[PDB]
Design a protein around this nucleic acid. Structure first.
Lengths: 100, 92, 63, 111
RNA sequence: GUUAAUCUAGCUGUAACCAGUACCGAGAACGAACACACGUAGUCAAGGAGAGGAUCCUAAGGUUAGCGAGUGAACUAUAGC
RNA sequence: UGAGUAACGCUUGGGAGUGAGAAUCUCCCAAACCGAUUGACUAAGGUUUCCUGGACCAGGGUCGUCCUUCCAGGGUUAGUCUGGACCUAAGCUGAGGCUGAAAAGCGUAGGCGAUGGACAACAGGUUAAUAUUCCUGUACUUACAGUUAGACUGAUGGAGUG
RNA sequence: GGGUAGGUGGUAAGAACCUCAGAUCCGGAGAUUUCCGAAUGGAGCAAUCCGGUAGUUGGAAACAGCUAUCAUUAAUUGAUGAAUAAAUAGUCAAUUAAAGCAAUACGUGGUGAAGUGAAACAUCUCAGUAGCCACAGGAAAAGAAAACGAAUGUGAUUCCGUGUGUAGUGGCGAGCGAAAGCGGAACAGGCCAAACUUAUCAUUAGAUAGGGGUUGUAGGGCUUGCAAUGUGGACUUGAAAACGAUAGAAGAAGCUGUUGGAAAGCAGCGCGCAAAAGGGUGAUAGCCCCGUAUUUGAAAUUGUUUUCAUACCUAGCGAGAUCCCUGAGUAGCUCGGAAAACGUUAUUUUGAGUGAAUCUGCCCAGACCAUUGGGUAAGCCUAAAUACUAAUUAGUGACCGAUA
């Protein structure tokens, strides 16, 4: 039921749960765009749970309590891109100064 | 930071041709009111990779099901294509 | 408008006739005249005032 | 309250299938039918193969399947006595065990 | 402001938003109730003869005009004599 | 009824293939065409008709395996191009204001309204559907800091180019 | 709160789920409610673009998210503030209301046609209709006599019938048409200025705020007495009660054979009605089903009425006195109109001018004078009785049945 939502700490745990459910629902919809979901019913269930938690939060205050303190391979590819750009710029400037 | 601008990633033959290269192109369908920077921020905060190029395009509503005793209209759609630095690929 | 600033009272519309008793929708305009009025605040201001109200002000020492 | 509860025995009053007994499975009170097992076995023709030659388990032939029965044609069955009479139903009895109970009008037997 | 601001120049990093982008387009898709011989902005503009974007045949490029097959009366239209 | 008649609204032939059936569908080869045009590139307008697969009930002034027809699935990617966030001509709206029974009409300060002004990207390749945008190569502008060198910077206003 | 076994809104077959730890459903009360749109941060080609300001997070920043606000007018209050010293206009800051829509229907008001009839037509009728416009309201408007009017009179207003196709008005033509009185619907009258007086206004205030009175059987103020402690509602709130309204519950009675695809129709014997309205069920069913008359039921919201308490407003009868007051561009008059049944005549109203009295008054009784009698304008407010139904509930129909 929904009475179990009034009992818990409505300050910080509920909003973290909302964020986790939003992330999971987004992943679920992404899987729905693909073939591997296999559980149609979860989308509406999560949507209704999110609606209920939003209502119970709105009865008191806002959803976004951001005032608090709310991959890794990117570094390698970014280093490669920066190196390539640096090399291109260096050779361009070297040719430009060699022109005269 | 709501992630309410990524509806569905499409999978067509043009896409399949697109990722086979060295850039690993990605394409999403986006809320028609979200701009380039919004999509860039959402993509950065959903996978952790800062995109290099972000491009957008639109599809006008088109008449579909011409003979049905009720002429329906195709829904307005906006697509955002995101490209990454060469040499990386991430699952969805 | 063609109305005095002391009270909303404009023209009157009616019928004009001749010896043939033919009807004609004709308007009659209340007379207006820009006579300065001195408000009891040390100030004077010019507004469109009807001649009858002007006589009332003259007899009421309101200038 | 509804006359027929899913699970109990039922008989038919009028129609071709006189003196027939059965168990209720599905009820559509919105448009007033009733599904009873073992009765009104109509000969469905599984017309699937001739649409296209792709599907499997599509051409089996004449198959008996249930057909809906109008709700008002049914009557609940009595078996709490040696000599039973298929009678009416009364909802007024209210023990504290549940909200309401049902009883045959022509006798005094629970459900 | 001169206890520094203000621009100028190079190096380092960083940002560049929103709407249009298909196809048709002196016409079979546009405006003429039509797959009508009607009408419509600008831009490219080949060779021989020629003053010329006229005239004749062609280059690049592109169409097969959405009914036909016969005979070759009178008569009609187009022309030639 | 008018009647299976008038008209069917700027042109061909052959071979092979598809097919249930082909003058019309496909391919191949010819010819006859306009060529300051029936071609190549786009404004305003049409909003999917563009591509692929399927079908030929209806629509194709004949037929039809085929269609700008229908169904199903896809397709337009921009710091530099088109127009905004820059600028103004007619003209529109219009605070205060004037005016008129009322509705309202006029007009100031302002604000909008390009067919014009300033404004930085070119060549090539790739897809059936996009490409100064996707990609390869080479460039530029405008903000933004940190850093470094030099320098007193010089407006909403004045003046000339514009 | 009611109510339980199915539910995932219709084109609906289904894969996957929820479900008696009380689901779906009904009613009441609550929240998100993107954008346009009176649209109001600024514009615009309605569903678009661009912002300013204040917090908050990422950062080095541009900026980006996450929140709130930013139209105008009118009123009030404050600061500011010119030509010109002050002061005024203007400016800024803050608060409070609208700004529109529609119910093809009613109301008030402003403006305001022609065709047509008169067998033509200008007077006239249509018509004070249609259209346009302003503002409403739950109805609106009007309203307490300076009335009628011929009476030993009635006594606010509103609506109906009659009076009556009467009196009359009309190129005396088409036409038009009252007012009394009577019988009905409903019914109740109150509140300001004035003299008098108090307090304050550079006390010159002429202005501000309090008592006093609401006028014709003339009244009120003044000086001075008696007796009230109450009649009461156009009426402030609190406590309760009844009757509804928005969900539901209980709620009677049959078999047998028959033609028959199927019985409920038909035949035999039965049963109940405060329930023989109606609908469905393989043919026209009282007893097959939902129901229906009646008896009940409201967590919450809401309406009307009733009782008590309570706040404001209110009361009778005397005496003096040539004491004072009793609605100013007011009314008549003239020049043109208009509502009046009247086509301009007292009545009423007003565009231009003219412009009194103070109870010994003023006006009224279709020119006027005198007498007689009646009433107190030039201030304000008002419930019901009247018209209408786009909405919700229930019901009705000698109204229609797919060219209706």
């Amino acid at each position: 039921t929904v009475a179990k939502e009034l009992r818990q700490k409505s300050s910080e745990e509920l909003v973290k749960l909302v964020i986790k459910l939003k992330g999971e629902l987004l992943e679920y919809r992404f899987k729905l765009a693909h073939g591997e979901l296999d559980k149609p019913h979860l989308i509406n269930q999560t949507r209704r749970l999110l609606a209920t938690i939003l209502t119970i939060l709105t009865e008191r205050k806002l959803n976004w309590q951001e005032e608090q303190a709310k991959n890794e391979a990117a570094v390698n590819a970014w280093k490669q891109h920066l190196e390539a750009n640096k090399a291109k710029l260096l050779k361009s400037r070297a040719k430009r100064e060699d022109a005269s | 930071d709501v992630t309410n601008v990524l509806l569905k990633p499409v999978l067509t033959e043009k896409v399949y041709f697109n990722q086979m290269g060295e850039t690993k192109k990605y394409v999403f369908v986006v809320n028609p009111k979200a701009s380039k920077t919004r999509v860039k921020l959402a993509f950065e905060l959903v996978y952790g990779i800062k995109p290099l190029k972000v491009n957008t395009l639109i599809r006008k509503p088109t008449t579909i099901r011409g003979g049905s005793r009720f002429p329906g209209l195709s829904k307005l759609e906006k697509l955002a294509v995101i490209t990454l630095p060469k040499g990386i690929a991430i699952s969805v | 408008a063609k109305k005095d600033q002391l009270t909303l009272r404009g023209p009157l519309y009616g019928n004009n006739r001749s010896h043939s008793k033919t009807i004609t929708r004709r308007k009659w305009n209340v007379n207006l005249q820009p006579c300065k009025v001195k408000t009891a605040d040390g100030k004077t201001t010019r507004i469109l005032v009807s001649t009858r109200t002007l006589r009332t002000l003259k007899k009421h020492n309101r200038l | 309250m509804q006359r027929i509860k899913k699970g109990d025995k039922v008989v038919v009053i009028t129609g071709k299938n006189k003196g027939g007994s059965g168990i209720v499975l599905k009820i559509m009170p919105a448009r007033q039918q009733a599904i009873v097992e073992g009765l009104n076995k109509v000969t469905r023709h599984k017309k699937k193969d001739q649409t296209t030659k792709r599907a499997a388990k599509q051409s089996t032939g004449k198959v008996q399947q249930e057909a809906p029965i109008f709700l008002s044609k049914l009557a609940l069955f009595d078996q709490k006595a040696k000599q039973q009479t298929i009678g009416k139903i009364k909802y007024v009895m209210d023990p504290k065990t549940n909200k309401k109970t049902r009883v045959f009008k022509k006798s005094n037997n629970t459900l």
